[PDB]
Amino acid sequence: SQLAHNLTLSIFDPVANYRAARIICTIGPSTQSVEALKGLIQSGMSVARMNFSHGSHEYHQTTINNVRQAAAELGVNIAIALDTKGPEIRTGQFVGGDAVMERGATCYVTTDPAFADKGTKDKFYIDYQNLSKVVRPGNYIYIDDGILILQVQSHEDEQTLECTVTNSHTISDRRGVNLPGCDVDLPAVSAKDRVDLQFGVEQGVDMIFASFIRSAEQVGDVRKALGPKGRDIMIICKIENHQGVQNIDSIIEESDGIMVARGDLGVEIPAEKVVVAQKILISKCNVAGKPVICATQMLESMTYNPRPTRAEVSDVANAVFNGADCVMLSGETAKGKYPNEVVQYMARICLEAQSALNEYVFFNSIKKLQHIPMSADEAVCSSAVNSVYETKAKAMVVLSNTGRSARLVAKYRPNCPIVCVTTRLQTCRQLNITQGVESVFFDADKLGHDEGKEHRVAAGVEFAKSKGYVQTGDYCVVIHADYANQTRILLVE
Amino acid sequence: SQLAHNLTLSIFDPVANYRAARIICTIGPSTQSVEALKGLIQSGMSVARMNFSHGSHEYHQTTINNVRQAAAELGVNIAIALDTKGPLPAVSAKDRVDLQFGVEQGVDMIFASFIRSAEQVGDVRKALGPKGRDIMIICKIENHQGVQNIDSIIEESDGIMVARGDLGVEIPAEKVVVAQKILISKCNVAGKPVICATQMLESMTYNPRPTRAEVSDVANAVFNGADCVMLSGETAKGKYPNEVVQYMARICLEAQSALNEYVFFNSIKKLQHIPMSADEAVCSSAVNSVYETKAKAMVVLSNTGRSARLVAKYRPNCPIVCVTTRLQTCRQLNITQGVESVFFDADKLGHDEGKEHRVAAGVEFAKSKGYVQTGDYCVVIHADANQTRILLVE
Amino acid sequence: SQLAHNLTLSIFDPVANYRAARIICTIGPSTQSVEALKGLIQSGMSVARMNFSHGSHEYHQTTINNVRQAAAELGVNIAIALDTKGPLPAVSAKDRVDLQFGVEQGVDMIFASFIRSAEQVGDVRKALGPKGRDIMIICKIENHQGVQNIDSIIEESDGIMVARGDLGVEIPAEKVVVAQKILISKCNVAGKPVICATQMLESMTYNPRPTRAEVSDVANAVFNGADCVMLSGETAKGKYPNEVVQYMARICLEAQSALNEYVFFNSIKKLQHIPMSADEAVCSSAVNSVYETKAKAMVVLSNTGRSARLVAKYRPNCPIVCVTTRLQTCRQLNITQGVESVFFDADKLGHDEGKEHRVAAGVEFAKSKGYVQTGDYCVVIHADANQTRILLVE
Amino acid sequence: SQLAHNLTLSIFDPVANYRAARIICTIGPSTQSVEALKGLIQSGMSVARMNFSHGSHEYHQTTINNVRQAAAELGVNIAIALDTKGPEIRTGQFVGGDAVMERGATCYVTTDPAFADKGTKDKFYIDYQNLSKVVRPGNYIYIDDGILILQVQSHEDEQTLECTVTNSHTISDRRGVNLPGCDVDLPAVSAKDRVDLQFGVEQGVDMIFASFIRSAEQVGDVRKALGPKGRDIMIICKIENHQGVQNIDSIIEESDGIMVARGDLGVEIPAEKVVVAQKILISKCNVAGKPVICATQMLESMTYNPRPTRAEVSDVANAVFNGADCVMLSGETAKGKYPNEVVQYMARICLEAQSALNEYVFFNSIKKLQHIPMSADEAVCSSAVNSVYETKAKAMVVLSNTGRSARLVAKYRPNCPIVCVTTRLQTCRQLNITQGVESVFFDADKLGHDEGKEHRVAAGVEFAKSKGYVQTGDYCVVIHADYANQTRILLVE
Numbered sequence A, D: 001s002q003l004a005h006n007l008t009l010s011i012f013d014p015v016a017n018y019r020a021a022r023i024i025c026t027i028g029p030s031t032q033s034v035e036a037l038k039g040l041i042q043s044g045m046s047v048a049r050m051n052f053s054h055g056s057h058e059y060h061q062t063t064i065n066n067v068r069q070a071a072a073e074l075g076v077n078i079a080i081a082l083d084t085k086g087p088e089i090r091t092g093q094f095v096g097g098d099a100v101m102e103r104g105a106t107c108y109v110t111t112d113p114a115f116a117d118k119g120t121k122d123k124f125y126i127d128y129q130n131l132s133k134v135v136r137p138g139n140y141i142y143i144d145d146g147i148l149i150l151q152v153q154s155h156e157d158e159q160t161l162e163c164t165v166t167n168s169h170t171i172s173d174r175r176g177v178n179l180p181g182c183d184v185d186l187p188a189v190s191a192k193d194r195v196d197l198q199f200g201v202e203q204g205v206d207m208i209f210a211s212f213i214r215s216a217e218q219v220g221d222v223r224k225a226l227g228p229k230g231r232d233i234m235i236i237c238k239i240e241n242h243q244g245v246q247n248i249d250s251i252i253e254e255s256d257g258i259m260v261a262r263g264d265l266g267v268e269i270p271a272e273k274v275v276v277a278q279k280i281l282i283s284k285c286n287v288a289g290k291p292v293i294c295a296t297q298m299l300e301s302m303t304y305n306p307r308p309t310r311a312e313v314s315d316v317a318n319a320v321f322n323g324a325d326c327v328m329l330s331g332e333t334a335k336g337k338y339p340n341e342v343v344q345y346m347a348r349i350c351l352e353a354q355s356a357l358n359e360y361v362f363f364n365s366i367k368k369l370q371h372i373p374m375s376a377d378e379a380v381c382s383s384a385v386n387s388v389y390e391t392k393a394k395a396m397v398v399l400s401n402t403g404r405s406a407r408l409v410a411k412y413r414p415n416c417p418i419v420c421v422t423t424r425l426q427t428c429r430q431l432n433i434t435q436g437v438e439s440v441f442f443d444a445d446k447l448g449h450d451e452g453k454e455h456r457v458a459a460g461v462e463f464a465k466s467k468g469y470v471q472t473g474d475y476c477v478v479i480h481a482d483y484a485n486q487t488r489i490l491l492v493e
Numbered sequence B, C: 001s002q003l004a005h006n007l008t009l010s011i012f013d014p015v016a017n018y019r020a021a022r023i024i025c026t027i028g029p030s031t032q033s034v035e036a037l038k039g040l041i042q043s044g045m046s047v048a049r050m051n052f053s054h055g056s057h058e059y060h061q062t063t064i065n066n067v068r069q070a071a072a073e074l075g076v077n078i079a080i081a082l083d084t085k086g087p088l089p090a091v092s093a094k095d096r097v098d099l100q101f102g103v104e105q106g107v108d109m110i111f112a113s114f115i116r117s118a119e120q121v122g123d124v125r126k127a128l129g130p131k132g133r134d135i136m137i138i139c140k141i142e143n144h145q146g147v148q149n150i151d152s153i154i155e156e157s158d159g160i161m162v163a164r165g166d167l168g169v170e171i172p173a174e175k176v177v178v179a180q181k182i183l184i185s186k187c188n189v190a191g192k193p194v195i196c197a198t199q200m201l202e203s204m205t206y207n208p209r210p211t212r213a214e215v216s217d218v219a220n221a222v223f224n225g226a227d228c229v230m231l232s233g234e235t236a237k238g239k240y241p242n243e244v245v246q247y248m249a250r251i252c253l254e255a256q257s258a259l260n261e262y263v264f265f266n267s268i269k270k271l272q273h274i275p276m277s278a279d280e281a282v283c284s285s286a287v288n289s290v291y292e293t294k295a296k297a298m299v300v301l302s303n304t305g306r307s308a309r310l311v312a313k314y315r316p317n318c319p320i321v322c323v324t325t326r327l328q329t330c331r332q333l334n335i336t337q338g339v340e341s342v343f344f345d346a347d348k349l350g351h352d353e354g355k356e357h358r359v360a361a362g363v364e365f366a367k368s369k370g371y372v373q374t375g376d377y378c379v380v381i382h383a384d385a386n387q388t389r390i391l392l393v394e
């Protein structure tokens, strides 16, 4: 049926009148200013990502205010995402400043703090105390973004390892280190993470991109760290290693969403398997009805070039085909030369891919996996999307305050736009990581509570008409679920 | 049910015991020697491509002779492919002489460059003449015209090549991705081999390893349902000709582990019109039997290889073993995915009208490769006067 | 999946908590008195049939008056049906006067005798006039012409009666069985009530018990999917008027225990064309919801009863409760299977545009009959400006 | 889909060119002669049933020889069926000859043998020793074909019961008695049964209609009784009471087929439930792939009348609709006035019903109930019938010696005739209780073994052409299974 859909397609037929997939942009010096951010919003940005691995609270404070200003001036809602620093293993200091590692040379990595400030080419410090327990002779240690690769030969003692330098590379003070294949038992949240998350709650961020998640128990740690005030902030778990992939089922259940970080995964898992892992994680989230983000090596060559490679274009397209809600941009928007052109092009690719995509395969697949009997919530939303296909309805209107109904509806993948009408601006922002949904804020303060709902309903249809999704004579499937639910098949005037 | 299949998958489970996708290699300075060609075959080459845009007849004669020698010393059959220069007319004067050479040297298939319409395929057929009627024409789609007339082109030709790079010159890259989907799916329906070509693992021509984007490209080509993936510069002039073929084989095997063949089987079966003619019904039913009984191999008796291609069309989730009386067929089935050919010498072994000798040879091959053991089911199909056997392995 | 359903069944399991099929009784000397009519209602009568082939207006006036009194004293709604003499013209001079009487006395439905074509239904409509436009015409198929023109007849009429005895006069009995299958299935598709009539439990008119063949006849009529079964002599002039209605109710309930409503639901849904109009989509989806969530009752807000009939068409495996503002509808829905009507007095209780009062009345009725308790699901549907609610019962 | 099939039907379109259902006739004085039997064969009889409740070995010897003679003279194969007497509870003798039971009178049924020969209206004998154990006050005892109904009031002692006569009826010496609802523990086979079965084997009967089967263990008793010589004779279990219905699953598995005796069932189970029980037993046998016979009250009024009641006509038709292989005639052929006209009419009804029947519903239903993976036998036959629907094949040819493949193929219900080619005349006869199959005997003695099979295959196609099922240009699905199997889709010349 995806096969069958391909036969009817023509590459010369006009694209769809809406883009379902959502674009996340990492903010950096190339895009932090208000006018640069207004550029990105018009280019197709829905979520602004702050990378808390770099820059101070003052720096990310600027981002928060500029993102809020740029959004207000354009009268749109943009989500703010906090990407945590997470746990990190780093080397110590070197005398004096660096150390040049010759290929074939023997060196000693020690876990003893007495060498934290007197590292040399021959012996230097690594700050993770259990390093000796988790690493075995034959294993590899990556240092400085995986540029320096060295192989562990033997245990010199319970604190130091004998290594051989595979790579000629000069390393500086306090470089990050990777332990491919090893079971790292660092805390879920670091001491710095607790501070940054605290800040996130105080500044009212919409979501946390929680780094290096390995088990379900770690998701609770992030929740505890966010505290009672932050109980409504979405936790999106970043899967970065084998543990995260292995524990994916329990992690998905505890998280509000997932991020597939292909680059971090590519460190210790062969790239061919990372492609397959992507399919797995995206499909699992689709069934769960939780947002999924395809992140990392998207249009990276377009950081310095006006156009990407062809293989990169198919990578972005196939992310949509896999069923990803979101596609992410890192250095392309943060430090790149073409921050607007890369977001505009990613939008074009997502829309082109969507035109080829058969949403009915998604609907049918996700429907068949529901056990009988279904519960009310599941039944209503699945049936609503069913009605859309049944009647060739050209829009949907979902009344959801928290965004739960909207996410559940989007889960079943209609072939029409989903308009969500919410009384909460927080929900307008948070739904930006759910594909195929657009938010309309209904001001319950200066417009009333509207228990009759038909003000909120007409507000949704008004939005659908203005965007050109529906006209007179068209069908629109309206749904309000909360379990006080209802489904209306409406004729548009 | 690809979505349902993705859920059950684990990337830490062992890979499949066979690769279904096929690999085509472009021969060049880096790989023309007998020893280099033995390296390629062991790495996973099924088809040798000669690029006639460059080199003389004497140069490509070396390739033809070396490939046949490298193959003989390894006891395997390798397909030899002629890729015409092309341009404007379909066949040029240069092409007419080149195709003349191909017939005389007995090449297995033609990669016809820059094919834009259905009658242009006939010009290539005309140039081959009566002696080369058994040579396959694989049309290369390189422009908007080829994409537009694709329905008629597929009907006239024996297969398609999706040249993404050439199509990219004029069509925006994002649309070339979709065009790949269409071209491959149409070819699957027709039951004719489709080749994904150009810009495959290009960075690995001078680098020890390719980019991640390039890896996903190869994988998704297999996911789209391509019979073949093709290497151009990577084997012709590259620094790592053996490693790039071994890596592509690894990617194809990994992708195949993730691929749900049942979706392919079911999609193609549903598009068949009732009533089905004998050949379609026999073949779809036999593939169905495999799924029905969890059979671990198939045996197809096919002389011309028509039966083998039609069975392959329905995508079993087990290896297909084709027992053929012709070596020509053995080489030609190297562009059809999920098939492995076994030569049965009708000269020094007999005609075998009872067919039990040919069948026994197929089962023996499936046993020797470790596809089926005692107690396993194996669907046998002969359809020249057809028959279907579900055989229990002793 | 009726075959699959038969496997799971046990004849020692308790019967279903409701009967879906409806029973129509012919009033006669044996049953005209108020007390006899109360006996019939308690035994399972939903519809009273007056046979106008015999008796005077004064005689049938007694029936009309007695039925309404017997029904009032039991607080139930009973449908009054006029069965015309018939013959040749559709409506005769006698029929024109009889139908005149029916309108003036406000009968609920007409059983139009010997209907052969679609325009003949219009003659019955003509005879009813503007005052009787809300009276249902159920055409009686009694000959080969009626069977032949059945498609147009069903389209014009509000329902069908399969008169097996009358059809038997000319058509061989074995073909009348098949004709019953066709007529009933066509009516199910149209979503219009179908009545199985004549030769039902005929031996039980003078005998205390019927033959086994007669029992299977009644059961299979329910299996074919008839809304109603009808008693003629058995109640009009019989020795055991109460026992025969109680026994038919028992048979219908037993058959319904064996019947797989999902087969009916699925067969009718598949015959719908995509795209569906709102009404069809709303109703099929609501019945689907019941199966999807194992809901134990349905509530339909319907004034004219169009919604109730359309929901009933899709055959839920749970009771349907129709909340109507009109008593006319309550009586008229007595020929639609699986439906029970609740009267909502719009005069002394309000218009209820919010609909929550009408809905609460339906749930209350489903509670009082023991269909749903706390924790059970109940699909509510209003479709005059439509809406669908899956309500959890408190 | 049966619903959908009904819409396309027209009662004026010509009937099918073959009848699938099979007709069983009970032989009696009305049909025992050779010419009367030749009458029945031409009328549509496939199986001759002997009722061993009545008539001596000499009487049934006559039937066997006359049935064999009548079949030979017409060059057709007819099955001979032995319907066993089975266990029976009877009263004792009365002085002198009878006893008149007044309605409302009190009488005493005793199990004490001393009253076997001096029964009166007041006290008389019943020969079943455990009668006191199985019957409780309030229960009913039926005597003389259920004409005499009396209600047990109390236990007079451990040997006699106090009863009240509900029915005015005069009863004769040694009348049969029923115990509705009671768990009768009489032996599976009686002493007389063992003698009659012995005779059956010696005379080479094809099948046993084993009376009053209550459990699976009883089926083994009949098998043991039939002995090593009779190991190939089919055992068809007669379900006559609640126990048989309750144990149906295990009984079906041990038997070669089932008979639904609606009359015997109607004794203790209300008729409405007997209709439902019929649906259950027929569908269970269809899944099992074992023949099922609808027996008893078929066209009974046609025993004395030239035509049956309309309700009887729909009864016979609905037996076919239920999915019964066979319909049976008892007194209609044994003692009736119109033995030819009743078989001819039953044939007309079966053929008319079949014309309305959608075999594809049967195929699909039985296919969906097969678990994955299927075994070879199941896979081949299901797939063969699939090919028939797939190609609109107009015939099937099955090479089966025992008839196993033929039964398995027929199980899946093709919409075309099934021609079975067997080297065994025993199989030709036995397949007469399997619907939609016709047998061709291939003489392996005077025609060879034919390992190439294509002689047997061409013999089948020859038969299919002669009956007019296939002509030139038609498809025919050929199958040989044994697990040396094969499937050919053949073009007819």
Ligand SMILES: Cc1cc(C)c(S(=O)(=O)O)cc1Nc1ccc(Nc2c(C)cc(C)c(S(=O)(=O)O)c2C)c2c1C(=O)c1ccccc1C2=O
Binding pocket: A029, A054, A055, A056
């Ligand atoms: C300077 C250097 C030394 C080495 C050794 C290497 S290495 O050898 O390749 O690794 C690379 C670089 N290059 C840079 C380093 C820092 C830079 N700014 C920066 C950063 C990156 C982080 C933080 C935290 C802060 S701070 O917190 O505000 O102080 C600041 C100011 C920048 C650059 C650029 O090259 C650059 C080029 C064009 C435009 C802008 C920048 C740029 O901003």
Ligand SMILES: Cc1cc(C)c(S(=O)(=O)O)cc1Nc1ccc(Nc2c(C)cc(C)c(S(=O)(=O)O)c2C)c2c1C(=O)c1ccccc1C2=O
Binding pocket: A026, A027, A028, A029, A030, A051, A054, A055, A056, A059, A329, A330, A331, A332, A334, A335
């Ligand atoms: C402007 C520029 C141009 C060039 C060419 C280069 S060069 O190429 O390195 O020389 C560097 C820069 N400068 C930066 C580049 C990246 C930065 N963030 C960052 C980092 C360090 C790593 C990753 C992995 C990612 S991510 O993957 O995209 O999330 C991100 C966003 C930052 C800066 C800053 O200047 C800066 C100044 C003050 C505070 C914070 C930052 C800052 O955070």
Ligand SMILES: Cc1cc(C)c(S(=O)(=O)O)cc1Nc1ccc(Nc2c(C)cc(C)c(S(=O)(=O)O)c2C)c2c1C(=O)c1ccccc1C2=O
Binding pocket: D029, D054, D055, D056
């Ligand atoms: C005679 C009698 C007494 C009573 C009391 C009653 S009752 O009151 O209604 O029960 C009924 C009857 N009626 C019959 C009884 C026996 C009959 N033959 C017969 C039987 C039935 C079994 C056996 C074993 C043997 S034997 O083994 O060969 O001896 C024979 C000869 C017959 C009849 C007929 O009426 C009849 C009518 C027309 C044609 C043929 C017969 C007929 O053959």
Ligand SMILES: Cc1cc(C)c(S(=O)(=O)O)cc1Nc1ccc(Nc2c(C)cc(C)c(S(=O)(=O)O)c2C)c2c1C(=O)c1ccccc1C2=O
Binding pocket: D026, D027, D028, D029, D030, D051, D054, D055, D056, D059, D329, D330, D331, D332, D334, D335
């Ligand atoms: C010829 C006739 C006409 C009339 C009218 C009548 S009447 O109606 O009773 O008076 C009786 C008869 N005679 C018979 C009737 C039935 C018979 N078998 C039988 C029985 C006794 C019960 C049931 C239940 C069934 S069954 O259900 O059909 O299997 C059957 C076959 C038999 C006879 C014999 O004469 C006869 C003679 C010698 C040996 C054996 C029999 C014999 O077995």
Ligand SMILES: [K+]
Binding pocket: A051, A052, A053, A083, A084, A085, A086, A211
């Ligand atoms: K980070």
Ligand SMILES: [K+]
Binding pocket: A354, A355, A356, A357, A358, A359, A415
């Ligand atoms: K689309």
Ligand SMILES: [K+]
Binding pocket: B051, B052, B053, B083, B084, B085, B086, B113
């Ligand atoms: K070329």
Ligand SMILES: [K+]
Binding pocket: B256, B257, B258, B259, B260, B261, B317
């Ligand atoms: K696979």
Ligand SMILES: [K+]
Binding pocket: C051, C052, C053, C083, C084, C085, C086, C113
């Ligand atoms: K009448």
Ligand SMILES: [K+]
Binding pocket: C256, C257, C258, C259, C260, C261, C317
């Ligand atoms: K039911």
Ligand SMILES: [K+]
Binding pocket: D051, D052, D053, D083, D084, D085, D086, D211
């Ligand atoms: K018997």
Ligand SMILES: [K+]
Binding pocket: D354, D355, D356, D357, D358, D359, D415
């Ligand atoms: K038929």
